[PDB]
Design a protein around this ligand. Structure first.
Ligand SMILES: OC[C@H]1O[C@H](OC[C@H]2O[C@H](O)[C@H](O)[C@@H](O)[C@@H]2O)[C@H](O)[C@@H](O)[C@@H]1O
Ligand SMILES: OC[C@H]1O[C@@H](O)[C@H](O)[C@@H](O)[C@@H]1O
Ligand code: NA
Length: 555
C-alpha cells in the first residue's frame, strides 16, 4: 500500500538558492531530523563527502568545477542494520543558466504582497528554476516601458487592462536575483497594439496579408484584450532601431537580464508593404543580431512556435533554444524529434526548453492536472536532455500563462520536485554531450517487455547515451500507456504499475567496474550501486524499481 515514493520521503531537504556559482556555499534546510543518519554528497553516483546528519540547518561548499550536478542524500541506519533514504536534493553548480536551463514564468504583477511573491519564488527555487519569463508584464508590445526612463509610470494597465505595479515587477526581479535566477522580460519581436504612435511606426514597417498593402496581418484577440496585435517586419531596420530603443528603456528602469522574444508562428503567405514576401523565418536572424548588438550584455531567447524560425535562428546569439510544441508534433516521438532537430540546427551548441502545455483540453475548465500525464511527459523530456517550461505561480495548461484553471495535487507537487531534483542532479549525463545508442538489453525474468525508442504502448522503451566513458540506459515505461500523445490533453494517461526487482541482460564490450541506478521514482533519485556479473560481453543485474523512468549507468 506504499504511497508514491516522493510522498514517502521522511524528510523534506531544501537549499537556499536555485543554483550556485562556483565558490558559493550551499545552505541546507531539513524539515525534520533523525538519529543515526549520514549525509552523502554524490557526483555521478560517486560519494565525494560524508558527514553526520546533525541538525536542521547546515552548509556545504561544493567543488568549484563549473557546470556540475550533485545529489545530496541522507541515510538513516535503522536498528536492524538496514538503511533508509530519508531525503534528497539536487544541486546545480553553474556559472550561467544557459547550459542547463530550467525555465519558469511569472504572470501576475499587480498588487501582490512581498510575502506572497516570496512564496512564489521560494517554490520555484525548490524546483531549481534558474530563470523566469515575465509574461505580460509589459505596458504595450510596441512600448513595453510605461512612462519614460526619467519618469517610469509606477502603475500601468496591461493588455487586458489590469494594473501592473512597477514595484511588483522590480520586487520579483530582486527576489529571483536573490535566488540566483535570471529574469527575462516577455515581448513579441514585432508587436503593435492599436494605440501605437503612427509617427514612430510607419505603414512601411507592417506585415500585410496581401501584396497591395491593403490588410495588415494581425493576431485577433477578443475580450478582455484591449487590441488586436498588428505585425511588423523584424528585418526592417527602422523597426529594429525603434525596438532597440524601447528595450534600452526597459533595461534602464527594470533590471532584467534579457528579453524573451515571442512570435505568433507561421503566418502563411504574408507580405511587406512593397508586396514582397515578408518570409518571417528569414527575418528573425537580423532581428536577433540587432537586438543583441543594442544590448550586448543582455540575454536573448526566442520562441520557435512549432519550430517556425528554428533552423534560421539556431546559430544566432540566443542563450539556448526554445520550441512551443503544437500539432502535428503530438507524439512522444515528436518531442524527441524536436530535441534531435534543435541539436542539429545548433550544431550541438544549445540545449532546448519546450513550452508544451499539458492537459490542454482539460484546462478549459477548473480541474486537477493528471499527475501521471505530467510525470510521463517530463520523464521523456528530461531523459532526452530536454527541459520543460511549465511552472510559475501555477503550472501551465494553456499558451496564455495567466490561465490557472488546473491545479497540481500535493502528490504531483511532491513527485515533480523529485523529477526536477533528478534532472538537476544528473544534468551532466542528460544534456552535457555524448551520443545516443541502442543498447542490446533483454529481460532475464519476463517482468519487463522491452523495446527501443520510439515507444510502443505495452512496452518499456530502452534508449542509451554514451557520455564520456559511461554508458547510460534509460528505461521509460509505456507498459500501461493508453496513449502515446505527450499532451495528455484530457488527462486520461495511466499511472504505471510498479515493476520490481527486474533482471536485465546487457551486451557491453568493455570491462565493467561499477553499475549504478537512479530513478526519480525510487529513493528520491539517490544513486544506488547494483550488484552485477560480467561474462564476456554479457552483464547481468537487477533494477530495484521501474515505474515511469529508471536510469542505469555503466562504468
Ligand atoms: O487564451 C487567451 C489568448 O491567449 C493567447 O493570446 C494572447 C497573447 O497574444 C500574444 O501572444 C501577445 O504577445 C500576448 O501579450 C498575449 O497574452 C492566444 O494566442 C489566443 O489564441 C488566446 O485567445
Ligand atoms: O566540515 C568542513 C566544512 O565543510 C564545508 O563544506 C562547510 O561549508 C563548512 O561549514 C564546514 O565547516
Ligand atoms: Na544553472
Amino acid at each position: 500500500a506504499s504511497a508514491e515514493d516522493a510522498v514517502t520521503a521522511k524528510i523534506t531537504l531544501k537549499t537556499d538558492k536555485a543554483s550556485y556559482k562556483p565558490g558559493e556555499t550551499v545552505n541546507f534546510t531539513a524539515d525534520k531530523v533523525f538519529n543515526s543518519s549520514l549525509i552523502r554528497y554524490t557526483h555521478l553516483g560517486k560519494v565525494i563527502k560524508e558527514e553526520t546528519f546533525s541538525g536542521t540547518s547546515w552548509s556545504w561548499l561544493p567543488p568549484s568545477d563549473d557546470f556540475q550536478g550533485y545529489m545530496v542524500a541522507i541515510y538513516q541506519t535503522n536498528t536492524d542494520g538496514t538503511q533508509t533514504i530519508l531525503g534528497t536534493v539536487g544541486i546545480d553548480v553553474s556559472s550561467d543558466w544557459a547550459k542547463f536551463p530550467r525555465y519558469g514564468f511569472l504572470s501576475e504583477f499587480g498588487n501582490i504582497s512581498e510575502s506572497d511573491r516570496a512564496a512564489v519564488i521560494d517554490n520555484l527555487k525548490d524546483y531549481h528554476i534558474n530563470g523566469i519569463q515575465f509574461y505580460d508584464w509589459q505596458y504595450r508590445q510596441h512600448q513595453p516601458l510605461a512612462g519614460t526612463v526619467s519618469n517610469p509610470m509606477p502603475v500601468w494597465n496591461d493588455i487586458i487592462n489590469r494594473e501592473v505595479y512597477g514595484s511588483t515587477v522590480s520586487g520579483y526581479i530582486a527576489q529571483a536575483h536573490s535566488k540566483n535566477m535570471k529574469a527575462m522580460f516577455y515581448n513579441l519581436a514585432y508587436g503593435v497594439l492599436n494605440d501605437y504612435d503612427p509617427n514612430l511606426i510607419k505603414q512601411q514597417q507592417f506585415v500585410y496579408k496581401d501584396a497591395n498593402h491593403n490588410d495588415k496581418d494581425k493576431h485577433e484577440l477578443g475580450w478582455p484584450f484591449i487590441s488586436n496585435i498588428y505585425i511588423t517586419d523584424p528585418a526592417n531596420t527602422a523597426w529594429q532601431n525603434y525596438l532597440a530603443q524601447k528595450n534600452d528603456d526597459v533595461y534602464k528602469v527594470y533590471d532584467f537580464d534579457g528579453f524573451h522574444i515571442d512570435q505568433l508562428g507561421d503566418r502563411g503567405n504574408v507580405f511587406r508593404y512593397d508586396g514582397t514576401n515578408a518570409d518571417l523565418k528569414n527575418a528573425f536572424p537580423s532581428f536577433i543580431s540587432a537586438m543583441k548588438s543594442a544590448n550586448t550584455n543582455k540575454k536573448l531567447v526566442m520562441n520557435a512556435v512549432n519550430q517556425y524560425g528554428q533552423k534560421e535562428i539556431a546559430g544566432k546569439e540566443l542563450d539556448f533554444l526554445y520550441t512551443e510544441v503544437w500539432s502535428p508534433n503530438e507524439g512522444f516521438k515528436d518531442l524527441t524529434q524536436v530535441l534531435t532537430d534543435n541539436a542539429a540546427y545548433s550544431n550541438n551548441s544549445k540545449n532546448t526548453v519546450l513550452a508544451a502545455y499539458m492537459n490542454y483540453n482539460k484546462a478549459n475548465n477548473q480541474g486537477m492536472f493528471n499527475t501521471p500525464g505530467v510525470l510521463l511527459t517530463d520523464a521523456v523530456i528530461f531523459a532526452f536532455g530536454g527541459s520543460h517550461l511549465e511552472l510559475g505561480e501555477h503550472m501551465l495548461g494553456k499558451e496564455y500563462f495567466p490561465n490557472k484553471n488546473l491545479s497540481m495535487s500535493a502528490e504531483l507537487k511532491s513527485s515533480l520536485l523529485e523529477y526536477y531534483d533528478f534532472m538537476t542532479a544528473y544534468q551532466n549525463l542528460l544534456r552535457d554531450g555524448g551520443t545516443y545508442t541502442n543498447p542490446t538489453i533483454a529481460t532475464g525474468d519476463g517482468k519487463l517487455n522491452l523495446g527501443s525508442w520510439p515507444p510502443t504502448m505495452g512496452k518499456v522503451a530502452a534508449v542509451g547515451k554514451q557520455v564520456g566513458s559511461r554508458e547510460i540506459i534509460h528505461l521509460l515505461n509505456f507498459t500501461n500507456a493508453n496513449s502515446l500523445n505527450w499532451r495528455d490533453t484530457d488527462g486520461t494517461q495511466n499511472v504505471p504499475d510498479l515493476i520490481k526487482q527486474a533482471m536485465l541482460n546487457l551486451n557491453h564490450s568493455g570491462k565493467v567496474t561499477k553499475i549504478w541506478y537512479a530513478s526519480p521514482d525510487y529513493n528520491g533519485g539517490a544513486a544506488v550501486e547494483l550488484s552485477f556479473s560480467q561474462n564476456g560481453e554479457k552483464v547481468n543485474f537487477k533494477v530495484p524499481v521501474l515505474q515511469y523512468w529508471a536510469m542505469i549507468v555503466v562504468e
